[model samples]
Target chain A: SLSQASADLEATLRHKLTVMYSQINGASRALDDVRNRQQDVRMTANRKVEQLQQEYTEMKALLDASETTSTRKIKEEEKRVNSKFDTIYQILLKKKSEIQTLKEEIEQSLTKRDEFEFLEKASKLRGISTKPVYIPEVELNHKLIKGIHQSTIDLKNELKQCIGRLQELTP
Target chain B: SLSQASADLEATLRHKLTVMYSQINGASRALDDVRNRQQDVRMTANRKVEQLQQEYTEMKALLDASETTSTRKIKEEEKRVNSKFDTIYQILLKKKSEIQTLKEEIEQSLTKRDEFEFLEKASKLRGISTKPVYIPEVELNHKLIKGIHQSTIDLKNELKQCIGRLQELTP
Candidate 1:
């Protein structure tokens, strides 16, 4: 009964902490995934860039070819690569911004954990740490209460949101 | 007041989560410190290896001025180069192994974090949460606290252990 009381008391804090941890973990993983995806995008852009560069070189290599035709192809290819590169760069910049935000949240969480630990210890000394939760209402994430706080940081949801916004334009 | 309960609870959880997050950060930072030292070692090893290799090459060039008359010098140069090559290879291999070991530790920390998250969640659900408020105890590399478990993963200890072993090998 004593153990159970302690358990119940600590359960609330533990659950909340777990949710926060999971969210940060998810955010970290999401940043990695985005970086990886951005690399793929860059590679694709690079290939196109190279392909166009080669076309320009080939035109120079074939001086006998009509200047007008060669110039047209060169201009068209340049336009395509430039546009793709710009789009990819935009995507990368956006991902970087997202990562920065996540990092900030991580830092914020760390600060909060420190404060919580202090109060927890003070409560324990007073024998109030176990059976009764000290945390007040109003500030908890809704998902934390539902014990699904981890899912709130789902990368899939983020990806979905990102894709819905930019996939058509960039893909 | 009932409606505000969640907000209050969330704020408290935020505070606790911040402390736990800091602990995890401390652990991660410790692992990072190890990797940084490993990098330093590799750099030192690399410099020494390169210098020896350069000296060997110079000796070879000097002996090549007149191989017939410098037969003895040629042999000496050949021996020096061979010895240096062996030295380089050995050092390279050792450093590689050390890096591998450090990498494993990093992975272990990450694994610990995952385990901690899973366990923390389970504990919260089952009502078995406890907070070790004392920084010394909380921050120590507790075996029970798997990967990245709340921030005092004792980077200094891990670094001491690692560097000590490395020094033994190098000496």
Candidate 2:
């Protein structure tokens, strides 16, 4: 009677043991899955990190160039505009000098020490002004100079904001 | 004799079965570990994905604002610069007009249709210009307008480059 019940218990226990061994093997497969994903995690994050780093490198490059280039451009523009305007101013000054010279000599005819000198000066002065001395207008090239400066600055500010937002994201 | 050796084997098998049952319980814990990690994979990637999405959203928002704001600023700058310089131009034009009118009226004395009318006009014209008219130079506010416009545009261009790089990275 003892062997009878014990024999049935023995078979049941043997079956359960085999089933347990099989599941342990299945756990090995689960462990493998975790390992693979772990690899993917490092790799995927690495991809993003390297890419983000490269993006910032370009950003810095552009930022550096933006400032340097814009600064230089502004200087050149200032110089060019200044030269253009200065040329006109010089021409106007020359005209004023000619007018002053003519008027001075004409007045010298009034206070001439000698009649010959006075007549000679008056004859030269009478030939001074034939054409009307109305000044022609010249304007600055504001649009060209200003346009370049403004557009470049716009890029700088926009990029700066982007950099800030990205910094926050990274943190 | 039949139960002697067989009974020893039976006890051994029962002990092994108990050990195997415990191992199966250990496998349940292994399964749980895998399940937990599966959750983490989804959640971690979800965190990154959501954050990346948000980054792009802000990026786009900044880009949009950059253009619009820069555009409006440049327009205002153009108007401001134009008006400032135009006022000076109008003043110059007025001076030119005065000079021309004086010259025309003086010449008209020679071609007068009526002597009385001509003499009265000449009397009024005699009071025309006592002081010498030399145009005082007024220059454009190029620096201010150009600075604002250039800075804004610099931001736009830099932001654009960043956008392009980001789009490439995303792709």
Candidate 3:
């Protein structure tokens, strides 16, 4: 009878472990997708700023090539283009910050997922054999698995929220 | 006295030609910059959509791996993810249209600039001789250049507006 109870306990633990692993894996992948998106956005923004700088440089060269233009008018045009550059930079900075916030949250999700993976592996190695109820390791594994299961669920919900907010910003 | 007037007329035409060429060159560069921006945005947006699609595929895989989940729950999750996809696509479409509108204006500017270049070359070949005022090409060139100059100014303003709108959307 004790052996039968041990078998039942093992089955239950395995089921919980499977569910936990599945959820954690899904969250990990989701976080990775978010990170990729943020990276893309940042890359595009960087290119945009660089292109703006190039345009300004070319404009200056064109101005230099033309000797007929008055110095005062050229200076005024410089001021105008300079202000435009500042405006574009400010807007891009806001976008960059939004992406950074999402990136940080995804990083946290990844850390937790890594911990979950380690625990899952450890639990598998220390499998229940003869008397699962009497063994301290079995009880410890149960408790740790329970804790991580709840935590993983919470992490998933947080990731979902972050995804929602990020969608709104991008839209 | 007539020869002196003819020389003065030739100098004025040459100065006008120089100014027009410089303006046209500047506008051509500006158009190129805008096109680069459009290409960047399109590439980033395309990557974004692909990533989102991958996320949805992975999510479906996770759902399939989840044998315990209900059809109703799966459908709801599917709806939520689809809505997110819609939101992102809408934003991209808006961005694409903005780029398109700007692109069309730039193309028109280029066309006008090309025409101005042709006129400049033709005028150069028909060197300012002693009877410059007697030539019919001077009056025609004057009218054409004036129209193009005004049109270029309008195109520049439209481009400025599009850039401002794009900044707002990004922020």
TM-score for chain B of all predictions: 0.30, 0.49, 0.36
Could you say which candidate leads in lDDT? 2
- For each candidate, the DockQ is 0.01, 0.00, 0.01
**Model 1 interface CAPRI class:** incorrect
lDDT of 3 by residue, B52-159 (tens): 344334433432332122222323433444455445445444544443444344334334543434333333322321110110111112233233333333333443
Least accurate 10 contiguous residues by lDDT in model 2 chain B: B130-139
lDDT tens digits by residue: candidate 2, A47-122: 4334434444444454445344434544454455445545555554555455445545545554552443443344
- Per TM-score, the best of the predicted structures is 2
Candidate 3: give its CA RMSD in angstroms. Answer: 54.7
Which has the better lDDT: candidate 2, or candidate 3?
2
RMSD of each: 51.4, 63.7, 54.7
Model 1 ranges off by over 4 Å: A1-122, A125-171, B1-14, B66-171
TM-score per candidate: 0.19, 0.33, 0.21
Candidates' lDDT values, in order? 0.37, 0.45, 0.37
Model 1 score (lDDT) = 0.37
lDDT of 2 by residue, B1-171 (tens): 634544443444344444444544444444454445445434543443344334444444554454444344434544554455455445545554554555555555535624434443444444444222332333333464345434444444556575455333322
